[PDB]
Amino acid sequence: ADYLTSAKFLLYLGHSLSTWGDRMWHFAVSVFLVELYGNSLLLTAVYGLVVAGSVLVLGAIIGDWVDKNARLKVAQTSLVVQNVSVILCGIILMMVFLHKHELLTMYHGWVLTSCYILIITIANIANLASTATAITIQRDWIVVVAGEDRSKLANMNATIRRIDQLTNILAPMAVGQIMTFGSPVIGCGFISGWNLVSMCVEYVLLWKVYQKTPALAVKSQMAEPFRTFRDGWVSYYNQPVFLAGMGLAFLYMTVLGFDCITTGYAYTQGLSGSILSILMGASAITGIMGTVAFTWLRRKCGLVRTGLISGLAQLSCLILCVISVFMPSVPIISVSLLFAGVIAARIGLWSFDLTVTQLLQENVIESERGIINGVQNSMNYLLDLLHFIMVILAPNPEAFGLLVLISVSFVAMGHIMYFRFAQNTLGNK
Ligand SMILES: O=C(NCc1ncccc1F)c1coc(CCNCCc2nc3ccccc3[nH]2)n1
Protein backbone atom coordinates (compact mmCIF):
# COMPACT_ATOMS: atom_id res chain seq x y z
CA ALA A 1 0.00 0.00 0.00
CA ASP A 2 1.75 3.12 -1.28
CA TYR A 3 -1.04 5.17 0.33
CA LEU A 4 0.56 4.89 3.78
CA THR A 5 3.77 6.53 2.53
CA SER A 6 1.93 9.03 0.32
CA ALA A 7 2.17 12.70 1.25
CA LYS A 8 -1.58 13.12 1.75
CA PHE A 9 -1.76 10.43 4.41
CA LEU A 10 1.45 11.69 6.01
CA LEU A 11 -0.17 15.10 6.44
CA TYR A 12 -3.36 13.46 7.73
CA LEU A 13 -1.38 11.54 10.35
CA GLY A 14 0.57 14.65 11.32
CA HIS A 15 -2.57 16.68 11.90
CA SER A 16 -4.27 13.79 13.71
CA LEU A 17 -1.38 13.28 16.12
CA SER A 18 -1.22 17.05 16.67
CA THR A 19 -4.93 17.59 17.33
CA TRP A 20 -5.18 14.53 19.58
CA GLY A 21 -2.53 15.94 21.91
CA ASP A 22 -4.10 19.39 21.67
CA ARG A 23 -7.56 18.17 22.68
CA MET A 24 -6.23 15.91 25.43
CA TRP A 25 -4.22 18.77 26.93
CA HIS A 26 -7.21 21.12 26.71
CA PHE A 27 -9.33 18.60 28.59
CA ALA A 28 -6.58 18.11 31.17
CA VAL A 29 -6.27 21.85 31.84
CA SER A 30 -10.04 22.32 32.03
CA VAL A 31 -10.35 19.44 34.50
CA PHE A 32 -7.43 20.85 36.50
CA LEU A 33 -9.13 24.23 36.83
CA VAL A 34 -12.49 22.65 37.67
CA GLU A 35 -11.04 20.28 40.27
CA LEU A 36 -8.40 22.38 42.03
CA TYR A 37 -10.55 25.54 42.21
CA GLY A 38 -14.25 25.22 43.15
CA ASN A 39 -14.93 28.41 41.15
CA SER A 40 -13.98 28.14 37.46
CA LEU A 41 -16.19 30.37 35.27
CA LEU A 42 -14.49 33.46 36.81
CA LEU A 43 -11.08 31.85 36.15
CA THR A 44 -11.89 29.97 32.95
CA ALA A 45 -13.13 33.40 31.88
CA VAL A 46 -9.72 34.81 32.78
CA TYR A 47 -8.18 32.02 30.70
CA GLY A 48 -10.41 32.97 27.78
CA LEU A 49 -9.58 36.66 28.07
CA VAL A 50 -5.82 36.01 28.31
CA VAL A 51 -5.89 33.58 25.37
CA ALA A 52 -8.09 35.64 23.07
CA GLY A 53 -6.24 38.96 23.24
CA SER A 54 -2.81 37.34 23.10
CA VAL A 55 -3.96 35.52 19.98
CA LEU A 56 -5.51 38.73 18.64
CA VAL A 57 -2.12 40.45 18.65
CA LEU A 58 0.51 37.75 18.31
CA GLY A 59 -1.57 36.06 15.59
CA ALA A 60 -1.17 38.91 13.15
CA ILE A 61 2.45 39.03 14.29
CA ILE A 62 2.73 35.27 13.61
CA GLY A 63 1.13 35.63 10.19
CA ASP A 64 4.00 38.02 9.57
CA TRP A 65 6.30 35.32 10.96
CA VAL A 66 5.01 32.44 8.83
CA ASP A 67 5.54 33.93 5.37
CA LYS A 68 8.90 35.50 6.26
CA ASN A 69 10.96 32.54 7.47
CA ALA A 70 11.72 29.19 5.83
CA ARG A 71 8.74 26.99 5.01
CA LEU A 72 9.90 23.93 6.96
CA LYS A 73 11.82 25.70 9.72
CA VAL A 74 8.78 27.71 10.82
CA ALA A 75 6.59 24.61 11.08
CA GLN A 76 9.27 22.67 12.95
CA THR A 77 9.81 25.56 15.38
CA SER A 78 6.05 25.87 15.91
CA LEU A 79 5.80 22.17 16.73
CA VAL A 80 8.79 22.41 19.07
CA VAL A 81 7.38 25.41 20.92
CA GLN A 82 3.90 23.91 21.26
CA ASN A 83 5.08 20.55 22.57
CA VAL A 84 7.71 22.07 24.89
CA SER A 85 5.09 24.43 26.34
CA VAL A 86 2.71 21.52 26.87
CA ILE A 87 5.54 19.57 28.52
CA LEU A 88 6.26 22.43 30.92
CA CYS A 89 2.56 22.85 31.69
CA GLY A 90 2.26 19.13 32.37
CA ILE A 91 5.28 19.20 34.67
CA ILE A 92 3.87 22.15 36.61
CA LEU A 93 0.48 20.42 36.83
CA MET A 94 2.11 17.24 38.14
CA MET A 95 4.00 19.23 40.76
CA VAL A 96 0.78 21.02 41.77
CA PHE A 97 -1.28 17.83 42.10
CA LEU A 98 1.46 16.09 44.09
CA HIS A 99 1.66 19.10 46.44
CA LYS A 100 -2.10 19.71 46.42
CA HIS A 101 -2.34 19.54 50.22
CA GLU A 102 1.12 21.01 50.89
CA LEU A 103 0.40 24.52 49.56
CA LEU A 104 -3.31 24.98 50.31
CA THR A 105 -2.35 25.09 54.01
CA MET A 106 1.35 25.72 54.68
CA TYR A 107 2.16 28.14 51.85
CA HIS A 108 0.65 31.57 51.33
CA GLY A 109 -2.07 32.13 48.76
CA TRP A 110 0.47 34.01 46.64
CA VAL A 111 2.14 30.69 45.84
CA LEU A 112 -1.11 29.19 44.55
CA THR A 113 -1.87 32.33 42.55
CA SER A 114 1.64 32.29 41.08
CA CYS A 115 1.24 28.64 40.08
CA TYR A 116 -2.06 29.51 38.40
CA ILE A 117 -0.46 32.46 36.60
CA LEU A 118 2.45 30.32 35.42
CA ILE A 119 0.03 27.68 34.13
CA ILE A 120 -2.00 30.39 32.38
CA THR A 121 1.06 31.92 30.73
CA ILE A 122 2.55 28.62 29.58
CA ALA A 123 -0.81 27.36 28.29
CA ASN A 124 -1.23 30.68 26.47
CA ILE A 125 2.16 30.23 24.80
CA ALA A 126 1.11 26.68 23.93
CA ASN A 127 -2.15 27.83 22.35
CA LEU A 128 -0.34 30.59 20.44
CA ALA A 129 2.06 27.99 19.03
CA SER A 130 -0.95 25.81 18.22
CA THR A 131 -2.48 28.67 16.23
CA ALA A 132 0.83 29.15 14.41
CA THR A 133 0.96 25.45 13.53
CA ALA A 134 -2.68 25.40 12.45
CA ILE A 135 -2.04 28.31 10.10
CA THR A 136 1.24 27.05 8.65
CA ILE A 137 -0.16 23.57 8.01
CA GLN A 138 -3.82 23.93 7.10
CA ARG A 139 -3.71 27.24 5.19
CA ASP A 140 -0.35 26.83 3.40
CA TRP A 141 0.89 23.24 3.21
CA ILE A 142 -2.52 21.88 2.24
CA VAL A 143 -2.73 24.37 -0.63
CA VAL A 144 0.80 23.55 -1.79
CA VAL A 145 0.47 19.76 -1.52
CA ALA A 146 -3.01 19.52 -3.04
CA GLY A 147 -1.81 21.83 -5.80
CA GLU A 148 -4.08 23.13 -8.53
CA ASP A 149 -6.43 20.13 -8.21
CA ARG A 150 -9.31 21.84 -6.42
CA SER A 151 -11.22 18.60 -5.75
CA LYS A 152 -8.20 17.14 -3.95
CA LEU A 153 -7.98 20.29 -1.82
CA ALA A 154 -11.66 20.04 -0.89
CA ASN A 155 -11.33 16.35 -0.01
CA MET A 156 -8.23 17.01 2.11
CA ASN A 157 -9.97 19.79 4.03
CA ALA A 158 -13.03 17.60 4.57
CA THR A 159 -10.88 14.73 5.85
CA ILE A 160 -8.99 16.99 8.24
CA ARG A 161 -12.26 18.37 9.59
CA ARG A 162 -13.65 14.85 10.03
CA ILE A 163 -10.64 13.68 12.02
CA ASP A 164 -10.77 16.92 14.01
CA GLN A 165 -14.40 16.22 14.95
CA LEU A 166 -13.87 12.55 15.79
CA THR A 167 -10.85 13.42 17.92
CA ASN A 168 -12.78 16.25 19.57
CA ILE A 169 -15.44 13.79 20.75
CA LEU A 170 -13.07 10.88 21.49
CA ALA A 171 -10.20 12.51 23.40
CA PRO A 172 -12.30 13.55 26.43
CA MET A 173 -13.78 10.04 26.57
CA ALA A 174 -10.37 8.35 26.56
CA VAL A 175 -8.88 10.79 29.07
CA GLY A 176 -11.86 10.35 31.39
CA GLN A 177 -11.54 6.58 31.19
CA ILE A 178 -7.83 6.96 32.00
CA MET A 179 -8.44 9.22 34.99
CA THR A 180 -11.24 7.07 36.42
CA PHE A 181 -9.40 3.78 35.85
CA GLY A 182 -6.14 5.17 37.23
CA SER A 183 -5.68 8.43 39.12
CA PRO A 184 -5.63 12.15 38.28
CA VAL A 185 -2.00 12.36 39.43
CA ILE A 186 -0.83 9.42 37.31
CA GLY A 187 -3.05 10.06 34.30
CA CYS A 188 -1.95 13.67 33.92
CA GLY A 189 1.68 12.60 33.51
CA PHE A 190 0.63 10.23 30.73
CA ILE A 191 -0.19 13.31 28.65
CA SER A 192 3.37 14.62 28.97
CA GLY A 193 4.83 11.35 27.68
CA TRP A 194 2.23 11.06 24.93
CA ASN A 195 3.02 14.60 23.79
CA LEU A 196 6.76 13.89 23.83
CA VAL A 197 6.29 10.76 21.70
CA SER A 198 3.97 12.69 19.38
CA MET A 199 6.59 15.45 19.27
CA CYS A 200 9.26 13.05 18.03
CA VAL A 201 7.02 11.22 15.56
CA GLU A 202 5.53 14.48 14.25
CA TYR A 203 8.97 16.01 13.76
CA VAL A 204 9.99 12.96 11.74
CA LEU A 205 6.70 13.03 9.83
CA LEU A 206 7.02 16.69 8.84
CA TRP A 207 10.64 16.14 7.81
CA LYS A 208 9.42 13.29 5.59
CA VAL A 209 6.49 15.12 4.01
CA TYR A 210 8.73 18.07 3.14
CA GLN A 211 11.01 15.74 1.17
CA LYS A 212 8.19 13.93 -0.66
CA THR A 213 6.95 17.08 -2.41
CA PRO A 214 9.65 19.54 -3.57
CA ALA A 215 7.15 22.31 -4.36
CA LEU A 216 7.08 23.35 -0.70
CA ALA A 217 10.65 24.69 -0.89
CA VAL A 218 9.80 27.17 -3.65
CA LYS A 219 8.43 30.40 -2.18
CA SER A 220 10.93 52.06 20.38
CA GLN A 221 11.42 48.36 19.67
CA MET A 222 7.66 47.85 19.23
CA ALA A 223 7.39 50.10 16.16
CA GLU A 224 8.17 47.33 13.65
CA PRO A 225 5.58 44.80 14.91
CA PHE A 226 2.87 47.48 14.74
CA ARG A 227 4.13 48.45 11.29
CA THR A 228 3.18 44.92 10.28
CA PHE A 229 0.09 44.92 12.50
CA ARG A 230 -1.17 48.10 10.83
CA ASP A 231 -0.10 46.70 7.46
CA GLY A 232 -1.66 43.30 8.10
CA TRP A 233 -5.17 44.52 8.87
CA VAL A 234 -5.28 47.06 6.04
CA SER A 235 -4.13 44.25 3.74
CA TYR A 236 -7.25 42.34 4.80
CA TYR A 237 -9.53 45.14 3.58
CA ASN A 238 -7.91 45.27 0.14
CA GLN A 239 -8.50 41.55 -0.41
CA PRO A 240 -11.79 40.58 -2.11
CA VAL A 241 -12.51 37.89 0.50
CA PHE A 242 -12.95 40.26 3.47
CA LEU A 243 -16.72 39.93 3.80
CA ALA A 244 -16.45 36.13 3.89
CA GLY A 245 -13.97 36.45 6.75
CA MET A 246 -16.30 38.78 8.64
CA GLY A 247 -19.21 36.38 8.16
CA LEU A 248 -17.13 33.46 9.40
CA ALA A 249 -16.03 35.45 12.45
CA PHE A 250 -19.61 36.44 13.31
CA LEU A 251 -20.60 32.78 13.05
CA TYR A 252 -17.59 31.95 15.22
CA MET A 253 -19.08 34.14 17.94
CA THR A 254 -21.95 31.75 18.67
CA VAL A 255 -23.32 30.77 22.08
CA LEU A 256 -25.39 27.93 20.58
CA GLY A 257 -22.56 25.43 20.53
CA PHE A 258 -22.00 22.60 23.00
CA ASP A 259 -19.14 24.16 25.00
CA CYS A 260 -19.06 24.73 28.81
CA ILE A 261 -21.96 27.25 28.86
CA THR A 262 -24.43 24.96 27.04
CA THR A 263 -23.10 22.20 29.34
CA GLY A 264 -24.22 24.42 32.29
CA TYR A 265 -27.62 24.98 30.67
CA ALA A 266 -27.76 21.16 30.72
CA TYR A 267 -26.75 21.09 34.42
CA THR A 268 -29.81 23.34 34.95
CA GLN A 269 -32.55 21.60 32.88
CA GLY A 270 -31.19 18.07 32.25
CA LEU A 271 -27.73 16.53 32.52
CA SER A 272 -26.17 13.08 32.73
CA GLY A 273 -23.11 11.28 31.43
CA SER A 274 -25.34 9.26 29.11
CA ILE A 275 -27.06 12.44 27.91
CA LEU A 276 -23.76 14.25 27.38
CA SER A 277 -22.30 11.31 25.48
CA ILE A 278 -25.40 10.90 23.31
CA LEU A 279 -25.58 14.60 22.45
CA MET A 280 -21.86 14.88 21.67
CA GLY A 281 -21.97 11.73 19.55
CA ALA A 282 -24.95 13.07 17.63
CA SER A 283 -23.09 16.36 17.16
CA ALA A 284 -20.02 14.58 15.79
CA ILE A 285 -22.09 12.36 13.49
CA THR A 286 -23.94 15.41 12.18
CA GLY A 287 -20.65 17.27 11.70
CA ILE A 288 -19.36 14.39 9.60
CA MET A 289 -22.65 14.49 7.69
CA GLY A 290 -22.12 18.22 7.18
CA THR A 291 -18.61 17.69 5.81
CA VAL A 292 -19.83 15.07 3.34
CA ALA A 293 -22.73 17.36 2.41
CA PHE A 294 -20.24 20.16 1.77
CA THR A 295 -18.27 17.90 -0.56
CA TRP A 296 -21.46 16.83 -2.36
CA LEU A 297 -22.70 20.41 -2.77
CA ARG A 298 -19.29 21.48 -4.07
CA ARG A 299 -19.54 18.67 -6.60
CA LYS A 300 -22.97 19.98 -7.65
CA CYS A 301 -22.50 23.74 -7.26
CA GLY A 302 -19.31 25.79 -7.06
CA LEU A 303 -18.15 27.28 -3.76
CA VAL A 304 -20.04 30.52 -3.12
CA ARG A 305 -23.40 28.90 -3.85
CA THR A 306 -22.47 26.05 -1.49
CA GLY A 307 -21.70 28.55 1.25
CA LEU A 308 -25.00 30.33 0.63
CA ILE A 309 -26.95 27.06 0.81
CA SER A 310 -25.18 25.95 3.99
CA GLY A 311 -25.85 29.32 5.59
CA LEU A 312 -29.51 29.15 4.62
CA ALA A 313 -29.83 25.68 6.17
CA GLN A 314 -28.07 26.75 9.37
CA LEU A 315 -30.22 29.87 9.67
CA SER A 316 -33.37 27.83 9.02
CA CYS A 317 -32.72 25.37 11.81
CA LEU A 318 -31.58 28.17 14.12
CA ILE A 319 -34.96 29.75 13.37
CA LEU A 320 -36.40 26.43 14.50
CA CYS A 321 -34.23 26.69 17.64
CA VAL A 322 -35.46 30.21 18.41
CA ILE A 323 -39.00 28.95 17.83
CA SER A 324 -38.30 26.30 20.46
CA VAL A 325 -37.06 29.03 22.80
CA PHE A 326 -40.17 31.09 22.01
CA MET A 327 -42.54 28.25 22.89
CA PRO A 328 -42.94 28.08 26.70
CA SER A 329 -43.63 19.54 34.36
CA VAL A 330 -40.12 19.70 32.91
CA PRO A 331 -40.37 21.26 29.41
CA ILE A 332 -38.67 18.28 27.77
CA ILE A 333 -39.87 19.52 24.37
CA SER A 334 -38.01 22.83 24.66
CA VAL A 335 -34.58 21.54 25.72
CA SER A 336 -34.51 18.60 23.30
CA LEU A 337 -35.71 20.80 20.43
CA LEU A 338 -33.03 23.37 21.28
CA PHE A 339 -30.42 20.61 21.16
CA ALA A 340 -31.71 19.37 17.79
CA GLY A 341 -31.54 22.91 16.46
CA VAL A 342 -27.95 23.16 17.70
CA ILE A 343 -27.15 19.87 15.95
CA ALA A 344 -28.44 20.97 12.56
CA ALA A 345 -26.77 24.33 13.13
CA ARG A 346 -23.53 22.38 13.55
CA ILE A 347 -24.17 20.66 10.21
CA GLY A 348 -24.59 23.99 8.46
CA LEU A 349 -21.76 25.58 10.44
CA TRP A 350 -19.19 22.98 9.46
CA SER A 351 -20.28 23.27 5.83
CA PHE A 352 -19.96 27.06 5.92
CA ASP A 353 -16.58 27.01 7.66
CA LEU A 354 -15.22 24.57 5.10
CA THR A 355 -16.47 26.80 2.29
CA VAL A 356 -14.91 29.94 3.77
CA THR A 357 -11.59 28.28 4.58
CA GLN A 358 -11.33 26.87 1.06
CA LEU A 359 -12.13 30.30 -0.39
CA LEU A 360 -9.42 31.84 1.79
CA GLN A 361 -7.03 29.13 0.59
CA GLU A 362 -7.67 29.61 -3.13
CA ASN A 363 -8.11 33.41 -3.25
CA VAL A 364 -5.04 34.90 -1.55
CA ILE A 365 -1.72 35.97 -3.03
CA GLU A 366 1.07 33.45 -2.55
CA SER A 367 3.30 35.55 -0.29
CA GLU A 368 0.47 36.53 2.11
CA ARG A 369 -0.97 33.16 3.09
CA GLY A 370 0.43 33.79 6.57
CA ILE A 371 -0.59 37.35 7.39
CA ILE A 372 -4.12 37.06 5.99
CA ASN A 373 -4.97 33.81 7.77
CA GLY A 374 -3.32 35.07 10.95
CA VAL A 375 -5.54 38.15 10.89
CA GLN A 376 -8.55 35.92 10.17
CA ASN A 377 -7.78 33.89 13.31
CA SER A 378 -7.25 37.15 15.20
CA MET A 379 -10.71 38.35 14.18
CA ASN A 380 -12.26 34.98 15.04
CA TYR A 381 -10.79 35.21 18.53
CA LEU A 382 -11.82 38.87 18.75
CA LEU A 383 -15.45 37.87 18.43
CA ASP A 384 -14.83 34.84 20.66
CA LEU A 385 -13.57 37.24 23.33
CA LEU A 386 -16.73 39.29 22.84
CA HIS A 387 -18.66 36.04 23.34
CA PHE A 388 -16.80 35.40 26.59
CA ILE A 389 -17.57 38.94 27.76
CA MET A 390 -21.25 38.45 26.94
CA VAL A 391 -21.14 35.19 28.90
CA ILE A 392 -19.62 36.78 32.01
CA LEU A 393 -21.91 39.79 31.62
CA ALA A 394 -24.95 37.57 32.31
CA PRO A 395 -23.68 34.31 33.87
CA ASN A 396 -27.19 33.50 35.11
CA PRO A 397 -29.04 30.28 34.17
CA GLU A 398 -32.31 32.12 33.40
CA ALA A 399 -30.48 34.90 31.52
CA PHE A 400 -29.90 32.60 28.53
CA GLY A 401 -32.82 33.59 26.30
CA LEU A 402 -31.19 36.94 25.54
CA LEU A 403 -27.85 35.24 24.89
CA VAL A 404 -29.34 32.75 22.43
CA LEU A 405 -31.29 35.53 20.71
CA ILE A 406 -28.06 37.50 20.34
CA SER A 407 -26.25 34.42 19.01
CA VAL A 408 -28.89 33.76 16.36
CA SER A 409 -28.92 37.47 15.46
CA PHE A 410 -25.15 37.41 14.96
CA VAL A 411 -25.43 34.25 12.86
CA ALA A 412 -28.00 36.06 10.73
CA MET A 413 -25.67 39.06 10.39
CA GLY A 414 -22.78 36.80 9.39
CA HIS A 415 -24.83 35.09 6.70
CA ILE A 416 -26.08 38.51 5.54
CA MET A 417 -22.46 39.59 5.09
CA TYR A 418 -21.75 36.35 3.23
CA PHE A 419 -24.73 37.01 0.95
CA ARG A 420 -23.33 40.49 0.33
CA PHE A 421 -20.05 38.81 -0.61
CA ALA A 422 -21.87 36.43 -2.96
CA GLN A 423 -23.57 39.35 -4.70
CA ASN A 424 -20.27 41.24 -4.91
CA THR A 425 -18.28 38.34 -6.40
CA LEU A 426 -21.13 36.69 -8.35
CA GLY A 427 -23.64 38.46 -10.58
CA ASN A 428 -25.98 35.50 -10.96
CA LYS A 429 -27.68 32.78 -8.94
O1 LIG B 1 -19.64 26.73 17.85
C1 LIG B 1 -18.48 26.37 17.70
N1 LIG B 1 -17.60 26.89 16.84
C2 LIG B 1 -17.82 27.93 15.85
C3 LIG B 1 -16.99 27.51 14.83
N2 LIG B 1 -15.76 27.12 15.15
C4 LIG B 1 -14.88 26.67 14.18
C5 LIG B 1 -15.31 26.60 12.86
C6 LIG B 1 -16.60 27.00 12.54
C7 LIG B 1 -17.44 27.45 13.53
F1 LIG B 1 -18.64 27.81 13.23
C8 LIG B 1 -17.93 25.39 18.40
C9 LIG B 1 -18.56 24.49 19.15
O2 LIG B 1 -17.55 23.66 19.67
C10 LIG B 1 -16.38 24.14 19.16
C11 LIG B 1 -14.99 23.57 19.44
C12 LIG B 1 -14.16 24.59 20.22
N3 LIG B 1 -13.83 25.78 19.43
C13 LIG B 1 -14.22 26.99 20.17
C14 LIG B 1 -13.35 28.19 19.79
C15 LIG B 1 -12.44 28.52 20.96
N4 LIG B 1 -11.60 27.66 21.51
C16 LIG B 1 -10.98 28.31 22.50
C17 LIG B 1 -10.05 27.90 23.35
C18 LIG B 1 -9.55 28.76 24.31
C19 LIG B 1 -10.03 30.06 24.35
C20 LIG B 1 -11.00 30.42 23.43
C21 LIG B 1 -11.45 29.56 22.53
N5 LIG B 1 -12.36 29.69 21.57
N6 LIG B 1 -16.61 25.18 18.39
Author numbering: 18 to 236, 286 to 394, 449 to 549
What does the primary publication say about this deposited structure?
A central regulatory mechanism of iron homeostasis in humans involves ferroportin (FPN), the sole cellular iron exporter, and the peptide hormone hepcidin, which inhibits Fe2+ transport and induces internalization and degradation of FPN. Here, we describe the cryo-electron microscopy structures of human FPN in complex with synthetic nanobodies and vamifeport (VIT-2763), the first clinical-stage oral FPN inhibitor. The structures display two distinct conformations of FPN, representing outward-facing and occluded states of the transporter.
In this position, the interaction with the extracellular loop connecting α3 and α4 located at the periphery of the N-domain is apparent. Notably, the same loop is recognized by Fab45D8, which was used to determine hsFPN structures in a previous study. In the hsFPN/Sy3 map obtained from a sample containing vamifeport, we noticed a pronounced elongated density of appropriate size and shape of the inhibitor that is not present in a structure of the same protein complex obtained in its absence, where also the proximal α7a–α7b loop appears more mobile.
